[PDB]
mmCIF file of C-alpha atoms and ligand atoms in Angstrom:
data_model
loop_
_atom_site.group_PDB
_atom_site.id
_atom_site.type_symbol
_atom_site.label_atom_id
_atom_site.label_comp_id
_atom_site.label_asym_id
_atom_site.label_seq_id
_atom_site.Cartn_x
_atom_site.Cartn_y
_atom_site.Cartn_z
ATOM 1 C CA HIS A 765 179.716 69.925 175.155
ATOM 2 C CA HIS A 766 178.339 68.570 178.442
ATOM 3 C CA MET A 767 175.317 66.492 177.502
ATOM 4 C CA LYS A 768 172.173 67.669 179.293
ATOM 5 C CA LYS A 769 169.822 65.092 180.813
ATOM 6 C CA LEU A 770 166.132 65.914 181.168
ATOM 7 C CA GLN A 771 163.216 63.798 182.388
ATOM 8 C CA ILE A 772 159.551 64.759 181.983
ATOM 9 C CA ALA A 773 156.324 63.255 183.360
ATOM 10 C CA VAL A 774 153.154 63.785 181.311
ATOM 11 C CA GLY A 775 149.533 62.873 182.076
ATOM 12 C CA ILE A 776 147.023 61.178 179.782
ATOM 13 C CA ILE A 777 143.836 62.211 181.575
ATOM 14 C CA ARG A 778 141.049 59.991 180.231
ATOM 15 C CA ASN A 779 137.446 60.087 181.417
ATOM 16 C CA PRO A 780 135.107 57.074 181.229
ATOM 17 C CA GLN A 781 133.736 58.366 177.908
ATOM 18 C CA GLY A 782 137.184 57.883 176.339
ATOM 19 C CA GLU A 783 137.943 61.604 176.070
ATOM 20 C CA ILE A 784 141.427 62.945 176.843
ATOM 21 C CA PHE A 785 142.046 66.352 178.397
ATOM 22 C CA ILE A 786 144.398 68.050 175.918
ATOM 23 C CA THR A 787 146.006 71.471 176.410
ATOM 24 C CA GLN A 788 147.584 73.910 173.945
ATOM 25 C CA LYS A 789 150.601 72.528 169.074
ATOM 26 C CA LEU A 790 148.520 70.285 171.352
ATOM 27 C CA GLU A 791 150.118 68.599 174.327
ATOM 28 C CA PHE A 792 149.489 66.552 177.404
ATOM 29 C CA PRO A 793 149.939 68.419 180.690
ATOM 30 C CA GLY A 794 153.038 67.591 182.681
ATOM 31 C CA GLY A 795 156.558 68.785 183.261
ATOM 32 C CA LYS A 796 160.089 68.240 184.517
ATOM 33 C CA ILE A 797 160.855 65.497 187.035
ATOM 34 C CA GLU A 798 163.109 67.018 189.666
ATOM 35 C CA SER A 799 166.209 65.094 190.638
ATOM 36 C CA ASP A 800 164.874 64.071 194.079
ATOM 37 C CA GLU A 801 161.486 62.689 193.032
ATOM 38 C CA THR A 802 159.825 59.816 191.218
ATOM 39 C CA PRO A 803 158.154 60.319 187.834
ATOM 40 C CA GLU A 804 154.737 59.961 189.453
ATOM 41 C CA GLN A 805 155.523 62.533 192.163
ATOM 42 C CA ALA A 806 156.331 65.022 189.406
ATOM 43 C CA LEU A 807 153.183 63.999 187.516
ATOM 44 C CA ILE A 808 151.007 64.646 190.574
ATOM 45 C CA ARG A 809 152.520 68.063 191.221
ATOM 46 C CA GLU A 810 152.558 69.148 187.580
ATOM 47 C CA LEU A 811 148.946 68.105 186.948
ATOM 48 C CA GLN A 812 147.834 69.977 190.076
ATOM 49 C CA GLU A 813 149.639 73.102 188.867
ATOM 50 C CA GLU A 814 148.703 72.922 185.201
ATOM 51 C CA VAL A 815 145.130 71.576 185.150
ATOM 52 C CA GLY A 816 144.037 71.700 188.794
ATOM 53 C CA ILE A 817 143.431 67.998 189.469
ATOM 54 C CA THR A 818 144.879 65.757 192.162
ATOM 55 C CA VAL A 819 145.881 62.437 190.610
ATOM 56 C CA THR A 820 144.260 59.573 192.547
ATOM 57 C CA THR A 821 145.770 56.608 190.682
ATOM 58 C CA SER A 822 147.994 56.358 187.621
ATOM 59 C CA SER A 823 149.675 53.698 185.538
ATOM 60 C CA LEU A 824 152.675 54.004 183.271
ATOM 61 C CA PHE A 825 151.439 54.166 179.684
ATOM 62 C CA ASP A 826 154.751 54.470 177.839
ATOM 63 C CA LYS A 827 158.307 55.577 178.547
ATOM 64 C CA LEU A 828 160.170 57.161 175.625
ATOM 65 C CA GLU A 829 163.869 57.987 175.528
ATOM 66 C CA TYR A 830 165.148 60.507 172.981
ATOM 67 C CA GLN A 831 168.859 60.885 172.229
ATOM 68 C CA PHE A 832 170.003 64.142 170.632
ATOM 69 C CA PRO A 833 173.592 65.298 169.934
ATOM 70 C CA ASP A 834 173.430 67.681 172.917
ATOM 71 C CA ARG A 835 170.871 66.224 175.318
ATOM 72 C CA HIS A 836 168.991 63.101 176.390
ATOM 73 C CA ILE A 837 165.253 63.432 177.126
ATOM 74 C CA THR A 838 163.096 60.842 178.902
ATOM 75 C CA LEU A 839 159.309 61.216 178.671
ATOM 76 C CA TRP A 840 157.196 59.200 181.089
ATOM 77 C CA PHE A 841 153.540 59.063 179.992
ATOM 78 C CA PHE A 842 151.053 58.156 182.730
ATOM 79 C CA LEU A 843 147.471 57.086 182.169
ATOM 80 C CA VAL A 844 145.292 58.919 184.712
ATOM 81 C CA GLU A 845 141.729 57.625 184.977
ATOM 82 C CA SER A 846 141.029 58.525 188.626
ATOM 83 C CA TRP A 847 141.459 62.021 190.012
ATOM 84 C CA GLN A 848 139.996 64.747 192.200
ATOM 85 C CA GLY A 849 138.818 67.966 190.572
ATOM 86 C CA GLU A 850 137.723 69.108 187.121
ATOM 87 C CA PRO A 851 140.545 69.758 184.605
ATOM 88 C CA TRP A 852 140.897 73.295 183.296
ATOM 89 C CA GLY A 853 143.610 75.561 181.971
ATOM 90 C CA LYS A 854 144.882 76.508 185.429
ATOM 91 C CA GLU A 855 147.979 78.223 183.997
ATOM 92 C CA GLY A 856 145.962 80.400 181.613
ATOM 93 C CA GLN A 857 146.434 77.913 178.705
ATOM 94 C CA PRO A 858 143.699 76.291 176.584
ATOM 95 C CA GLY A 859 142.425 72.860 177.553
ATOM 96 C CA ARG A 860 139.589 70.639 176.352
ATOM 97 C CA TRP A 861 138.309 67.079 176.197
ATOM 98 C CA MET A 862 139.141 65.350 172.914
ATOM 99 C CA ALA A 863 137.786 61.963 171.886
ATOM 100 C CA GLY A 864 140.641 59.468 172.046
ATOM 101 C CA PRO A 865 140.002 57.687 168.727
ATOM 102 C CA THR A 866 140.208 60.994 166.833
ATOM 103 C CA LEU A 867 143.515 62.493 168.024
ATOM 104 C CA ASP A 868 145.793 63.709 165.230
ATOM 105 C CA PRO A 869 149.450 62.786 165.896
ATOM 106 C CA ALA A 870 150.503 65.591 163.532
ATOM 107 C CA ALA A 871 148.784 68.085 165.878
ATOM 108 C CA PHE A 872 151.161 67.102 168.717
ATOM 109 C CA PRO A 873 154.937 67.531 168.875
ATOM 110 C CA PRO A 874 156.441 64.483 167.134
ATOM 111 C CA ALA A 875 157.963 63.308 170.423
ATOM 112 C CA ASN A 876 154.428 62.217 171.385
ATOM 113 C CA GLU A 877 153.825 60.278 168.153
ATOM 114 C CA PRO A 878 154.167 56.694 169.515
ATOM 115 C CA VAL A 879 151.802 57.519 172.383
ATOM 116 C CA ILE A 880 149.159 59.182 170.180
ATOM 117 C CA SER A 881 149.268 56.164 167.851
ATOM 118 C CA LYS A 882 148.567 53.822 170.774
ATOM 119 C CA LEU A 883 145.783 55.999 172.181
ATOM 120 C CA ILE A 884 143.901 55.878 168.872
ATOM 121 C CA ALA A 885 143.818 52.076 169.008
ATOM 122 C CA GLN A 886 142.421 52.071 172.556
HETATM 123 MG MG1 LIG B 2155 154.766 72.718 184.423
#
């Protein structure tokens, strides 16, 4: 019965050519925000772990809040256009640069849909 609460920080890593580093059901890298840290602190750690980059500067792109009967999920999406390192599948997972204007929202989990829609415009 106790309703779980989960918060996640995810990185939209975009190079100057407008490509986004997408890992794989495609997803943005990122993970759980621990209870003692900001969304961006979790973003920095998770992106270091998952794709081996150190986030230099970020900006909040969107914040989505999903209510389910058993849980409440918050997804913080950060635009990352400055970083140190070269993204790769550091956790043994696929990763590649995809042109922003061509992302398929149906190829991502539907929780990402409002963010994918906005990326295609930009
Ligand atoms: Mg993780």
